[PDB]
Design a protein around this ligand. Structure first.
Ligand code: A1CA2
Ligand code: A1CA2
Lengths: 181, 181
């Protein structure tokens, strides 16, 4: 199907996975509100491994309770862009409502250029508890020119992560990235 | 001056402190982009004290470099709403550009009701280093009805924090709050 705009999706009754898969630019604004996370999904830890070498690259964890939402800025080193197969172990809590079809679509762009879409299922989740999921990211094979542009233009690589439960958008996190660490 | 809308501010060449002081609702969307933080301000730690008792209430710190931006969700206990004078010690780094007039305007709302505006100056900042500032929040004297509504309706209390450097908006962080911890 043809490309859709951020403004078109905001006018819909419900945003479905198939709809965000036709966005052709990273969004400017968010496509849902914090209060749409009616399942209280809260990411608490992720551990990132290079699956070719088995090396743990890094682990990020949450340090009155706070939930960081909506936006993360990452600065990586240039070798990050040379990875091929990266495993993410993602820990998260969920609230008291049962979750079905928890699905994540991530779209990564350098400026206006889509680099890669990832579309993962989270699997079965126990309510009111910590849950864990492993995702395997097969990185795009980036050209040398694109790699150079991404290193030279920090934070112009950006992503949208759209999280669905039962085919309805419930969370939308954004990020930008540099590779000049 | 009369109230301004989020859409009116987005149409301006530059958003000034006086402009956000006339918003009469928490914003739906952000009034600047991540890339507008051309000073690379990154909050790294804050320590919150009840200044009446001297008690440290809590400290939040950041755990490849990441910067959490744009949105934090807080869950406090109901006693938080009874505080009167709260000291925040805020640690942050700044990039290589010199900073002048670093100013923060925070507006806190329960639903559509403005509870309090805070307007603080950060003082002088050394580029390319960690900086610290102390702010003193004089909490509004909330009615018992408002306190009850805020406890009973988690995450319907929301804030905008608008950060200015040299009278131009450079960061806009948002939060929502519960008081039923
Ligand atoms: C509030 C917020 O935003 N929470 C974030 C982080 S918590 C959930 C963590 C997840 C889903 C793991 C994210 C995976 C990684 C960081 C590994 C690095 C791989 C990439 C950045 C893709 C690389 C793509 C290209 C090179 C084109 C989020 O929702 O993700
Ligand atoms: C990305 C992001 O969002 N970073 C956040 C947190 S880093 C800077 C920390 C600051 C400015 C300290 C914030 C102060 C507190 C948390 C103390 C609690 C006081 C209140 C919540 C006001 C209470 C108001 C009423 C009861 C009406 C931000 O920019 O703030």
């Amino acid at each position: 199907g043809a490309a859709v705009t951020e403004q078109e999706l905001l006018a819909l009754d419900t945003i479905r996975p198939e709809h965000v898969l036709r966005l052709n630019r990273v969004t400017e604004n968010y496509l849902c509100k914090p209060e749409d996370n009616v399942y209280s999904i809260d990411f608490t830890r992720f551990k990132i491994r290079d699956l070719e070498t088995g090396t743990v690259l890094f682990e990020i964890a949450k340090p009155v309770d706070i939930s960081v939402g909506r936006f993360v800025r990452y600065q990586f080193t240039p070798a990050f862009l040379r990875l091929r197969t990266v495993g993410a172990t993602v820990e998260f809590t969920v609230g008291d409502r049962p979750v079905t079809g928890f699905r994540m679509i991530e779209r990564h762009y350098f400026r206006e250029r889509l680099l890669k879409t990832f579309d993962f299922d989270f699997g079965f989740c126990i309510p009111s508890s910590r849950n864990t999921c492993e995702h395997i990211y097969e990185f795009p094979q980036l050209s040398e020119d694109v790699i150079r542009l991404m290193i030279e233009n920090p934070y112009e690589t950006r992503s949208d992560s759209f999280y669905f439960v039962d085919n309805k958008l419930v969370m939308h996190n954004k990020a930008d990235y540099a590779y000049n660490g």
